[PDB]
Design a protein around this ligand. Structure first.
Ligand code: LXC
Ligand code: ZN
Length: 331
C-alpha cells in the first residue's frame, strides 16, 4: 500500500441533510455508448424512446471522454487531476471525488455489472462495493439464453440501502455492462430486438455492416430502458429526497470506420468515434438544480465538479471547472 495523495482537504459541505432535504443521486457509469447513435444528437433512429418521454432529461451533445477504455477512463472520471494531468498508474493512491464525498458524510454505494470500479472504491469500506455480475447478487440473469446478468438488476433492493441510510445524502454508482462488444447482440433481452437483422457472430468484420449497427442500436434501447427505470426508481423517493440522475459513458466505439472495431486505442490516434460519448442529466423539479446548455463543450473532467455540486461540496481544485449543472439559481 501507499499513502493517499490529497487533492481536496479544503472541501466543505455547505448544507447538511438535517437542515434541508437529503439528496439521493444515481450516477450511471455507461459503457461503449456513442454520442452519434443517440436520437437526441441527430441519429435517425429513435434509440432513446423512453428517455424522450421523461420531463427534465437534458441531453449533452458535445461530450468527449478522457480515454478509450474502461481501466483508463473510469478512474479519471472520478479524479481531481483531470484528463491533462491524469496518470492511470497512480490514480488509485489519489484522493478521488468519492473519497471526498464519503469523508463529508455522503453514503457511497457502487454496484457493478461491468467489471469493477478500477480502483475508485479501493479506500472505502469493502461492503460499499457489490459485484452485480454475480447471479447471487443480481436477480435478473435468467431473462436471456446467455444467462447474462442485466443492468436493471442493479436496481433491485436499492430500497434496502436507502432505508439503511435513512435521511442521509446518498450517491449510488451503477456500472453498466451497456454496449460492451464485440457481442452486442448479447447485451439486450429479446424485447429490445427492434432493429433487424442482427449480427450474431463474434467476428465483427464478417457480419454485414447494417446487422452490426442493428445489434449496437438494440443494445442502446436496453440502456434507454435501464436509465428510464433508474429515473423511475429515484422518483419513488422524490418526496423524501432531492433526486437526480447523471449518465456518462466511459468511451465510445468504432463500428467499422476505416476498418476499425471496438475501442481502447491510444488517444493520440484513436478515432473520434471512440471518444464522443453521450451524457444525460435528469433531476426532479423541486431540487433547484439547473442543467448547463445542451451544447456546452464538455469532457469527463466535468463529472467530479458535478458530483460535488450535487451535494453542495466546494473544492478548490475544481473551482474553475465546467460542470454539467449551473452555478446560478432561480428563486
Ligand atoms: O485512452 C487510453 C487508452 O484506453 C489506454 O489503453 O492507452 C492510452 C489511451 O490514451
Ligand atoms: Zn468500457
Amino acid at each position: 500500500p501507499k499513502d493517499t495523495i490529497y487533492h481536496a482537504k479544503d472541501a466543505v459541505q455547505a448544507t447538511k441533510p438535517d437542515m434541508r432535504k437529503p439528496r439521493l443521486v444515481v450516477f450511471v457509469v455507461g459503457e461503449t455508448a456513442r454520442a452519434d447513435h443517440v436520437s437526441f444528437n441527430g441519429y435517425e433512429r429513435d434509440t432513446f424512446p423512453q428517455l424522450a418521454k421523461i420531463d427534465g432529461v437534458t441531453n449533452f451533445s458535445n461530450v468527449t471522454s478522457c480515454g478509450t477504455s474502461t481501466a483508463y477512463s473510469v478512474p479519471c472520471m472520478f479524479s481531481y487531476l483531470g484528463a491533462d494531468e491524469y496518470d492511470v498508474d497512480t490514480a488509485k493512491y489519489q484522493e478521488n471525488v468519492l473519497d471526498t464525498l464519503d469523508r463529508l458524510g455522503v453514503s457511497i454505494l457502487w454496484r457493478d455489472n461491468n467489471s469493477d470500479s478500477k480502483g475508485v472504491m479501493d479506500k472505502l469500506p469493502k461492503a460499499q462495493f457489490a459485484d452485480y455480475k454475480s447471479a447471487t447478487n443480481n436477480a435478473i440473469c435468467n431473462t436471456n439464453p446467455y444467462n447474462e446478468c442485466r443492468d436493471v438488476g442493479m436496481l433491485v433492493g436499492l430500497d434496502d440501502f436507502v432505508a439503511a441510510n435513512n435521511g442521509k445524502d446518498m450517491l449510488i454508482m451503477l456500472h453498466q455492462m451497456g454496449n460492451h462488444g464485440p457481442a452486442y447482440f448479447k447485451r439486450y433481452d429479446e424485447k429490445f430486438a427492434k432493429f433487424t437483422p442482427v449480427c450474431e457472430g463474434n467476428e465483427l468484420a464478417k457480419c454485414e455492416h447494417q446487422s452490426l449497427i442493428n445489434a449496437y442500436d438494440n443494445a442502446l434501447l436496453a440502456t434507454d430502458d435501464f436509465i428510464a427505470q433508474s429515473i423511475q426508481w429515484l422518483q419513488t423517493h422524490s418526496n423524501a429526497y432531492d433526486v437526480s440522475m447523471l449518465y456518462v459513458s466511459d468511451h465510445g466505439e468504432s463500428l467499422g470506420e476505416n476498418g476499425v472495431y471496438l475501442h481502447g486505442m491510444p488517444n493520440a490516434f484513436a478515432p473520434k468515434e471512440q471518444r464522443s460519448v453521450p451524457a444525460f442529466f435528469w433531476t426532479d423539479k423541486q431540487t433547484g438544480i439547473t442543467p448547463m446548455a445542451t451544447d456546452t463543450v464538455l469532457t469527463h473532467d466535468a463529472i467530479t465538479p458535478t458530483l460535488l455540486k450535487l451535494f453542495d461540496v466546494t473544492a478548490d481544485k475544481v473551482k474553475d471547472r465546467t460542470a454539467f449543472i449551473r452555478l446560478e439559481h432561480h428563486h
